[PDB]
Design a protein around this nucleic acid. Structure first.
Ligand code: MG
Ligand code: MG
Ligand code: MG
Ligand code: MG
Ligand code: MG
Ligand code: MG
Ligand code: MG
Ligand code: MG
Ligand code: MG
Ligand code: MG
Ligand code: MG
Lengths: 60, 262, 62, 206, 143
RNA sequence: UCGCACGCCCGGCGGCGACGACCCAUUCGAACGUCUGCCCUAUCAACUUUCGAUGGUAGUCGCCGUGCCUACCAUGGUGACCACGGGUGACGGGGAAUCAGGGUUCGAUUCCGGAGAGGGAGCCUGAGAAACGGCUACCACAUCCAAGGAAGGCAGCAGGCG
RNA sequence: GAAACUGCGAAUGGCUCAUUAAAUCAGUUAUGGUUCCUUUGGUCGCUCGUACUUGGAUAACUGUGGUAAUUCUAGAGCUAA
């Protein structure tokens, strides 16, 4: 599951190749456009709150 | 046809345009305007096929959009503008003024006039309307809806319009003795005095017109255009002066003319 | 829809009896006297004659 | 879709005409408005020629005219009491053209008491302490008291109307088409028409 | 008498509830020299589709037929007759058309078999497009 | 709102055009109507009718008129003058062929009007479409695929198969 | 001046004759029973109660992508009528 994370206050965006389901259970089964704590995908990320803005399915 | 039609075939064109059978599939479709589809003459037909100032429609476009021709005292830039009856098409560089009247036959004629005559033209009133504050409105045949007219001018008369102000000067009441042009039907182009008015309630009324040489003929009101008080017009009349001499008289007058010219 | 005429007309006509001996001899005399190449160029002149004559008959009935 | 066709139905003789074309758009039908009484809700519909129509769906007020004395007021509608078309349009409270409604008589009472200064309605024994009817009825000058005296000989009303004014609500008939135009305009029933429809409502009650 | 329908049967233009202290009837002339009848003025009927006392204009064609059936209410059936010319045979055929026309209740006593003038109007029903404009009696039949 | 020239009072008045819009005429129309007109068949003589058929009333809808639709009433409407039903190797017409006078057959086809885009149906936008070189389905046919999906309509010009 | 937004056209033209037998269609009339983009001509201080110009989106552009695949499109930034 590729994750396209964008930050608008600097306006910089990056794709990150997360492939860990224990990292992704925090984003799983939540509805679009909610703010989520992002400390699960990395210990380096902490205090980052992130809106889930909808992606592309495995058939695009 | 799921909407308005935009073409016209060369064969289905009205015949008094005199368009040739062979050079085109299409005839120029007249744009919507102050004259009907079959009653008008397109400006491409007036330049290209008759005056021969142009050769093709591209040259017609070039003439019309160098802003030269000035029809009814205003320049129109579209190729297929409808120029109808009694319209003043003026060309400024040649200094040449044209007034559109039918000749003795059904077709329109190249009719050169003076600028002093080109400053005005004449219009048949179609309907009198009363507008939104008791305002008398007069509607002509070319949709010139001038308002506050003279209250003697009524439904089937004609008026004289100064084009620069776009306003009435004088008028002719529809009455017996006045000259009239027949602007439609089988009598298309005749000139004579109105000798009789036959009323018909419900259906359309007819008028007997006696020409310059005695030959009377009847025509319904919608095809009749009065052109001046009494026995004299207010415009200059074309060659032939609206008679329709017979085919025998046409034959021997061209035969005697060719015999006398040699 | 194309821009062309399609107005045409046969100028000759074929006779009803094909082998009438006196008609053959008369036509052969005419084309031999006037130097003609077939009989369609006597049939067309007889047909133009026929059209002029029926126009004359129709005017005489008027 | 839903259509208005002469081609879909039988001839004068009873024979069946077979269709030669599809359902064209210009032979159009639309679902009905079925305008009810409630807080107002009007939908616009795009029309042939790029026009628009205003379908009422709920409609509380309407502009009703009192024709004998020439006063129309915006007036709230309370009930539909009669319909010559159908009784279910009475039952399910439905505003159409020529349906007969009840509307409250208070603006007409205000105009009448402003114009003539006489009590209309007013079951005698009750008297309004907030003094607005008192300053309506009183305080005329000597020059204009004979003007009001000249008016109050033309101030007599029909007894059926006076019963409806004491009831506080009067009968109107709608004349605008509320599914078409949007409004619920109509006029107060008077005279022969009034007692005709009162006879009809009394026959409906029984 | 009148008021036999569900709604109030009234002429729309005249207002009948002006205050006092009989009813004024609306009528007109339809033109074309057709003289409006006496019962259309002294009448007590109302009619939406009467040519004289209703919102219809007589316009276009003026025809004449023969009354055959008067069973429909406020409207009757006339029978037009004409000779149709085939061009092969130099003869005629008798054909006929049965149209339904609207008979106003101003023309009171009409029997079957009398020539009736009708006039074209707006389409009044599915098959009615003509009003009755004047009635003449049959051959004799004055009894 | 937009563009050309650019001035005159003593900052304010200004020329010629473009674009846009309530309503009214006008134009190109359109759509419903009026009257009259069409091939064969009786081994098709009665048909239509509360499942609208014919009207009346009052409405709904529609741009408008109208059974167009709804409610309540009336029992009507057409037919031997051929209705109704069926057939058509039937688009209609201007016209074409043959022809003394009569007629007879043809008219798919360059002009006018209609209908239709495989079959039916439904609809967005727009002044105007029930549009198909526009969508939405269902039926038939059929293209690509990783099997999850996507895309189609030559009765347009060429061309291919049958 | 590419692109893109906006306006207009795309309902004309071209093809075919399957349907359809008072239907289509022809002549004749009516719309006083209606709609009409455009064109042309009218009207556009008529009302009596920040204007020295108001608001915030969005495409083209930039930059991350997804899908076996389409004139498929998502998220992030800007910016006009
Ligand atoms: Mg077409
Ligand atoms: Mg014969
Ligand atoms: Mg067939
Ligand atoms: Mg066929
Ligand atoms: Mg044909
Ligand atoms: Mg065929
Ligand atoms: Mg179609
Ligand atoms: Mg095919
Ligand atoms: Mg197409
Ligand atoms: Mg389609
Ligand atoms: Mg195609």
């Amino acid at each position: 599951m590729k994750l396209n994370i964008s930050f608008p206050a600097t306006g910089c965006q990056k794709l990150i190749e997360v492939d860990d389901e224990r990292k992704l259970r925090t984003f799983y089964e939540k509805r679009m456009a909610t703010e989520v704590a992002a400390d699960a995908l990395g210990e380096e990320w902490k205090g980052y709150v992130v809106r889930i803005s909808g992606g592309n399915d495995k058939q695009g | 046809a799921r909407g308005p039609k935009k073409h016209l075939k060369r064969v289905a064109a009205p015949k008094h345009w005199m368009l040739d059978k062979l050079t085109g599939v299409f005839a120029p479709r007249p744009s919507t305007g102050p004259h009907k589809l079959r009653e008008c003459l397109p400006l491409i037909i007036f330049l290209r096929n008759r005056l021969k100032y142009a050769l093709t429609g591209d040259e017609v476009k070039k003439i019309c959009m160098q802003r030269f021709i000035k029809i009814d005292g205003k320049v129109r830039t579209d190729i297929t503008y409808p120029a109808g009856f009694m319209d003043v098409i003026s060309i400024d560089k040649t200094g040449e003024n044209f007034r559109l009247i039918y000749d003795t036959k059904g077709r329109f004629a190249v009719h050169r006039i003076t600028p002093e005559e080109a400053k005005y033209k004449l219009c048949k009133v179609r309907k009198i309307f009363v507008g939104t504050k008791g305002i008398p409105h007069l509607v002509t045949h070319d949709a010139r809806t001038i308002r506050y007219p003279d209250p003697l001018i009524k439904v089937n008369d004609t008026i004289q319009i100064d084009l620069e102000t776009g306003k009435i000067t004088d008028f002719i009441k529809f009455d017996t003795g006045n000259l009239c042009m027949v602007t439609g039907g089988a009598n298309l182009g005749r000139i004579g005095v109105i000798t009789n008015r036959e009323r018909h309630p419900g259906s359309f009324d007819v008028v007997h017109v006696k020409d310059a040489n005695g030959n009377s003929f009847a025509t319904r009101l919608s095809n009749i255009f009065v052109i001046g008080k009494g026995n004299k017009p207010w415009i200059s009349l074309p060659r032939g002066k609206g008679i329709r001499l017979t085919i025998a008289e046409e034959r021997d007058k061209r035969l005697a003319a060719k015999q006398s010219s040699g | 829809p194309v821009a062309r005429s399609w107005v045409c007309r046969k100028t000759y006509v074929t006779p009803r009896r094909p082998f009438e001996k006196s008609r053959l001899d008369q036509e052969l005399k005419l084309i031999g006297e006037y130097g003609l190449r077939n009989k369609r160029e006597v049939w067309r002149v007889k047909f133009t004659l026929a059209k002029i004559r029926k126009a004359a008959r129709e005017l005489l009935t008027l | 879709g839903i259509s208005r066709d002469n081609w879909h139905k039988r001839r004068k003789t009873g024979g069946k005409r077979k269709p030669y074309h599809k359902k064209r758009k210009y032979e159009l039908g639309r679902p009905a408005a079925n305008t009810k009484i409630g807080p107002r809700r009007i939908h616009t519909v795009r029309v042939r020629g790029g026009n628009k129509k205003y379908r009422a769906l709920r409609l509380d007020v309407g502009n009703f005219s009192w024709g004998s004395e020439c006063c129309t007021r915006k007036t709230r509608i309370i009930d539909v009491v009669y319909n010559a078309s159908n009784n279910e349009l009475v039952r399910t409270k439905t505003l159409v053209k020529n349906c007969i409604v009840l509307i409250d008589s208070t603006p007409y009472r205000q105009w009448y008491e402003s114009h003539y200064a006489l009590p209309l309605g007013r079951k005698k024994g009750a008297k309004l302490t907030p003094e607005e009817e008192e300053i309506l009825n009183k305080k005329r000058s000597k020059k204009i008291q004979k003007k009001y005296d000249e008016r109050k000989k033309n101030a007599k009303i029909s007894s059926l109307l006076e019963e409806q004014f004491q009831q506080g609500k009067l009968l109107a008939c709608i004349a605008s088409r509320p599914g078409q135009c949007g409004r619920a305009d109509g006029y107060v029933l008077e005279g022969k028409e009034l007692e005709f429809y009162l006879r009809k409502i009394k026959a409906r009650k029984g | 008498d009148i008021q036999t329908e569900r709604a109030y049967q009234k002429q729309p233009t005249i207002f009948q509830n002006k205050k006092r202290v009989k009813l004024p009837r609306y009528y007109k002339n339809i033109g074309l020299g057709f003289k409006t009848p006496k019962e259309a003025i002294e009448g007590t009927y109302i009619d939406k589709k009467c040519p004289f006392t209703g919102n219809v204009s007589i316009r276009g064609r003026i025809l004449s037929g023969v009354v055959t059936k008067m069973k429909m209410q406020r409207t009757i059936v006339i029978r037009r007759d004409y000779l149709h010319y085939i061009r092969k045979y130099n003869r005629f055929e008798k054909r006929h058309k049965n149209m339904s026309v609207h008979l106003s209740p101003c023309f009171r006593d009409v029997q079957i078999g009398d020539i009736v003038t009708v006039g074209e109007c707006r389409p009044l029903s599915k098959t009615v497009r003509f009003n009755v404009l004047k009635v003449t009696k049959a051959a004799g039949t004055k009894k």
